[PDB]
Amino acid sequence: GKGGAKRHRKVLRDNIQGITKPAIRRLARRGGVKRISGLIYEETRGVLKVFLENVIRDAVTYTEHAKRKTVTAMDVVYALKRQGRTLYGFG
Amino acid sequence: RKVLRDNIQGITKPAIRRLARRGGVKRISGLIYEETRGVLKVFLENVIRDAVTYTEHAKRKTVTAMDVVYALKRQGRTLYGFG
Amino acid sequence: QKKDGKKRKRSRKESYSIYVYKVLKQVHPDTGISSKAMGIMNSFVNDIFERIAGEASRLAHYNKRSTITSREIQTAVRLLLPGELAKHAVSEGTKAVTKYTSA
Amino acid sequence: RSRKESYSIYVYKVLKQVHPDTGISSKAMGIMNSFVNDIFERIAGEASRLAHYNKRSTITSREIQTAVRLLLPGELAKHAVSEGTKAVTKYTSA
Amino acid sequence: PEELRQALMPTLEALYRQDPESLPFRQPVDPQLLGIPDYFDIVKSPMDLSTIKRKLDTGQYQEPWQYVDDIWLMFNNAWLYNRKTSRVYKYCSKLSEVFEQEIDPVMQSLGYCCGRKLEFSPQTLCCYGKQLCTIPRDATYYSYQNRYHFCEKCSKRKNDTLDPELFVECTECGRKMHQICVLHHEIIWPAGFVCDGCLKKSARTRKENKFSAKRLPSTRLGTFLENRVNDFLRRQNHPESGEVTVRVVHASDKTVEVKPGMKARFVDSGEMAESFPYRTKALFAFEEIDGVDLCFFGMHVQEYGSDCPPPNQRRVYISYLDSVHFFRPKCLRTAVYHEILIGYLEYVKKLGYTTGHIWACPPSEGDDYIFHCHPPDQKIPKPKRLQEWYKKMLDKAVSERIVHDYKDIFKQATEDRLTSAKELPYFEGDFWPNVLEESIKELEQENDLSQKLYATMEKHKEVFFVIRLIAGPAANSLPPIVDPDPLIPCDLMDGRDAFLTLARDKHLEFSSLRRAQWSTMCMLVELHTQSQD
Amino acid sequence: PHRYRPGTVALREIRRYQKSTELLIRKLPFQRLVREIAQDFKTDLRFQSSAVMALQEACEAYLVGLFEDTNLCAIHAKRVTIMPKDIQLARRIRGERA
Amino acid sequence: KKPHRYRPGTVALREIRRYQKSTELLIRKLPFQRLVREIAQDFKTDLRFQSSAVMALQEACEAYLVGLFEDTNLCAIHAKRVTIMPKDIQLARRIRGER
Amino acid sequence: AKTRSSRAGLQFPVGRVHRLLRKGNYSERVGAGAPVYLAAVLEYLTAEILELAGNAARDNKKTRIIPRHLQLAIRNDEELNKLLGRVTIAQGGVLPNIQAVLLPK
Amino acid sequence: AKTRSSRAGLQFPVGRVHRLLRKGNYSERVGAGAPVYLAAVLEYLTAEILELAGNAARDNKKTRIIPRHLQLAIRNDEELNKLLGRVTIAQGGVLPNIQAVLLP
DNA sequence: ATCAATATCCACCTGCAGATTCTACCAAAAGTGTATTTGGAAACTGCTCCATCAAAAGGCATGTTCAGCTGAATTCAGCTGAACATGCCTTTTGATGGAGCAGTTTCCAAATACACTTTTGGTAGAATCTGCAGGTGGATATTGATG
DNA sequence: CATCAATATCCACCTGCAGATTCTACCAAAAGTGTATTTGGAAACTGCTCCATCAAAAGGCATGTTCAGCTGAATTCAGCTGAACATGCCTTTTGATGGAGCAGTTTCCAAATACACTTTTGGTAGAATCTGCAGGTGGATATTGAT
């Protein structure tokens, strides 16, 4: 099979840091934030992390309820609307 | 029936002070009370109308506790103890 | 012989798109909508339908009413939509029902 | 007069099971009745939405169980699921 | 030996200068270094480009075909050991494209025809126990003695193989040419094969081919069709237009028998004849491209004359027609096809035939009517496009006042005040007899037959075309139909099965211009040999 | 004359009103205000006493939560005294205003 | 010789305007997809994901972040500041009631 | 003869709304004018929202409505913003808004 | 002569829950075990909050549960507080909570 | 460091509205047993679409410098907290005309439940059309910096 | 504070393409009409519960005033931490491609209504006894501020 070039990309464990510094900077700029402290980013990361089990778990609870193995956009739509954060365009 | 008016002043300054004390507030500025009163008015304007919109729908002429509690529930302020 | 059976697996789904586009022609004949735009419009109309139907069903349940009529729906329009929007929606519904009755 | 049903004797029996020497006041009783009614309504509505989303016209134990998992947080959900599973097992065992 | 070195240095140097694609082949494949210990298990001939250079330098190669075989063996090894998703496979594909571009002028400079490695399509075998089924391709099959084959439902292997092309050695210079590339046949030239270079060196020319389409026996229908096509081409005056020869190469009298269902329902009641006689004719269209005859169009027809009992009387039916898209010019090609069909529609109405029937059924994917192995780039027409093509041909025929009108079979049945299934024509191999048998069976499980016939008639009205050649009272006082063309006994075209079987067995493909020319030449030789008994 | 330092009586009230649960808004003025609001919304309305109590406790609880949020914003601004901008900020973050 | 250098804030305000005038996604697809996959496998292993589901989750998370960041900026400004600190986001989540 | 939407002068299908109300388990009985009233309300909402979206598009020199135009239409209308205060728009972005203190000088 | 509530060994009325589910128009059909499961969940929750309210009352030297005891129980449990984060308890007051900055 | 002036905690006891304990009805539930209907368990399967890999490329991760933001220290005008005098208006108990909330009968216009004919919306495939995403050329404030 | 000059970008214009738009034909799923059956709540009347109103007494905070403690607000200035920017590379995205599962088809059996009896019993009017804590008394005990 050969290959010639292959990178391990050991990022799976620390994928919360996968959210790049410029990504959070851009998100804050969209939020109208002019100056950002150094302690915001990782903190927001945790906030991001929290939101995941706020939504996707419910979607997972949806996926198990439908006897499916694939998470669908409709599961995500009900997961978000059940949190009071209804999303349009993915119906 | 008499057209009541200027009843927002019935929420006395000591009453708002007591509400703040229950809310854990230690110090009150002079402009707080009136401001809170306005907010309170808005809150009433948020609920009573809905209850009235309920009362009008039931062909009733009195506001019941069920209308109030259900309007609070539809406003995301569910209240217990009143049915 | 047999042809164009498509393995009897023609997936179909209902949508308000073609109706909403017609409404577009009533308000902006020379304006179009993207696929994302029509998807968001369908999601919005479905959300409004669900909210208004839930409010009407709850209101019918409150008065021990087993039939849904336009009265509790217009009451729910007053409850949920803001002032001018609710008033205009109520007027449109009243005119539509009046014209339907006389039709 | 029209009968107004409530969970009176059931909540009182639960109190006696958990606290034989502790009573409840009338206002607290009304709060508990409102709480149980609200939980019933929330779980039933969530189950109805679950059935509608999966094109199911029948509400079984699985739908309301999934609704309880969605609504009840963590340990409360786990204990409710275990107790309800035991209850339905005894119900179907007779 | 330095001559072939001087010839082949640019070809391999162009391969080397492709970076970074050609890097993995610079050195012998090292399994332990590359972490692939299974390389020897699958690949039986490990060697690389450096070994190729050493063999090209140390006096190992006697003639360039060995070098071509070595580089193509490298290509096959890289393709077989690596998945096409892998980097090495796509690098090998790019280098193969480069070599295919480079080697041809160099190989031709050495007096060879070409330097391509050419293999035939996989040869689908046939069953022997059932005598009716065949061996599926890319599927589990059983074989014995390399002569007997069996299917999975009738040595266990899967049929995925490629048959290379044969080679012919020149009698004078000893060089090896592709048989297809030079179009050499032993029967035509028993004296032996001589390459073009040797012939031009001594100012000689190849002996005239006596096994040609033009030298085939002449017939009135074929002569008329070829005259019409030649007149049309002369009128058009296209620079790429050539000479088209049309020969009727098969004509035999057969009979179609009523199937058991209709035999019980109507024949046993004395309302139908038990069988219908007809004359089946097979003809092919040939054109001279680059001085070589090439077959580009053929069709099979069934003709029921005035002696045939009704309702089949004086009716022609097109059972099968096929064509190959190598005609020059392309733009007139389709028109030329029309210039054939209309001519046939004329010839029959000169004989006395009044009705023509066409079944517009496009071939299924992987299926060929007459010409085996259609070119991959030749698109199969869709049913709607085929129907529009037939409608255009019929309109062109009408514009010449040869055809009065044409209709769908449903409208024709409605106009013909049809009241029973007995009034439809009965053709051999036609869809309608089979669907009528199926309707009879369905009635067996359950004017009902007429109702089902009408339902099927309306369902498939756009597929069947009924053409009126002679209409009105002129169709009621015609003389008996006499065919001036004598019978042509040829079992090789008794149906479309024999020609397809022969092409599959002898690898007579029509997938390329050279391959189609070779197939046409082989067909002509076979016909000329079968004529003499 | 004995006098307490500022904040001592306020904190005593903090425990006093965080320990007990009786209503702190006078019944009659709030009922009159509710009547005024109803009259402004619809003429000739009547009110049940339980509805009045439900409205009163709902407004009291909402104001208690708002005061807690306002105080949290006040210390967030390194202050001990709440000002109307704190209430505006709390309502804006809650989404009730914008 | 004195290379051109914008003062702190000019580029900040420029990118403020640029990212408030645009709607493109700001989180890179692959890392967020990996994070969602591992969070899902924390609850149920061997799960599969639709592309539309991932896009919907990304849009929802970015919308929640932009709203929360607006709240944090407002809270920081309330304290006579222009730079947000974790206390601002903690206050914003407390007022929203998430914590 | 005439569709219920045509009889009521409506664009959305009254029959489909009636069927969804029947299948939505909202009530055991469904009135005749209920789907008509609901369809009229929905038509008014879509008419106003697409009108505002077209206004935003023509202000943005655009002739095709995109999610950005829908977001501008809903957010610049405080009534629509209150209606959709708990709704986020896919690919809609946010309104251009810079704080006073963050502004220079 | 065995009641469906006692058949599963529950105190809450299974029949009443089933009848309310039917009257609630949540679905055209309701399963047999759904009222049993719902009654079990409701009775478990009732036991949990009642036990916590009794403990709070005992902490206050009270043997009668009052609305204040219910508020103390509901707000002192993290999961229960999350369950009723948008619910106001009648006559319950608020938890005694003073932050250090206001303290001397 | 001690001490006086207050608020806090708390044990105790008395009167009582609210919590708890029997008696009898009973109709609305609640339960059991057939006839009936049906959402769904279960197996085989076509078909999506989801996991996986290599190249092109579009940014992302680091080091420097400092203008400017944040934060610490100082001062004060005054405002709100603490205390107190005066009294008012809300709170509590009592009674009452009556507008109005609600129980019972009747029964029709409105609703439901199929049967059926009408049309209408959802999807496939071809082919023409088009709004707009960038790419190239000025070139327009503008802001940092020079003066 | 007026203006050389690098830079991001709105606009004037363009031009190619993925996506939106137009049209034809097919076809199952709605959809409207008709006919029969069923019933939800309107009106019609009336029993009755509590909603509103008036009256009287009183004291608990409501309102106003006065004194000043300390707190937000203003000011100043210093440690320093992020913003802007140049530099290096590397992680991402997209296109292509095996097969893990999402749905479509078919059977049929355990399971959920419809409904007519038959039995349990949760509200609940009524009267009597029990009982936890509201409220006042009195004195022990932190708490606070400044003597």
Author numbering:
A (entry chain B): 11 to 101
B (entry chain F): 19 to 101
C (entry chain H): 22 to 124
D (entry chain D): 31 to 124
E (entry chain K): 1051 to 1204, 1232 to 1523, 1578 to 1664
F (entry chain E): 38 to 135
G (entry chain A): 36 to 134
H (entry chain G): 14 to 118
Show the paper's wording.
Here, we report cryogenic electron microscopy structures in which a p300/CREB-binding protein (CBP) multidomain monomer recognizes histone H4 N-terminal tail (NT) acetylation (ac) in a nucleosome and acetylates non-H4 histone NTs within the same nucleosome. p300/CBP not only recognized H4NTac via the bromodomain pocket responsible for reading, but also interacted with the DNA minor grooves via the outside of that pocket. This directed the catalytic center of p300/CBP to one of the non-H4 histone NTs. That is, p300/CBP reads H4NTac at the bromodomain pocket, rotates in multiple directions, and rapidly writes NTac to non-H4 histones within the nucleosome independently of the DNA sequence.
Of these complexes, the p300BRPHZT·H4acNuc complex, in which HAT is in close proximity to H2BNT, had the largest number of single particles and its structure could be determined at the highest resolution (p300H2B·H4acNuc). We obtained the 3D reconstruction density maps of p300H2B·H4acNuc at 3.2–4.7 Å. The distance between the substrate-binding pocket and D22 (~10 Å) suggests that p300BRPH of this complex acetylates lysine residues from the N-terminal side of H2BNT up to K16. Besides p300H2B·H4acNuc, there were several similar complexes at low resolution in which H2BNT was located near the substrate-binding pocket of HAT. This is consistent with our biochemical results that p300BRPHZT facilitated acetylation of multiple lysine residues from K11 to K20 of H2B when H4NT is pre-acetylated. Thus, it is likely that HAT of p300BRPH can acetylate various lysine residues around K16 of H2BNT by a similar structural mechanism. In p300H2B·H4acNuc and p300H2A·H4acNuc, bromodomain binding to H4NTac interacted with the minor groove at the superhelical location (SHL) + 2. Also, acetylation of H2BNT was structurally the least dependent on the DNA-binding activity of p300 HAT among the histone NTs.
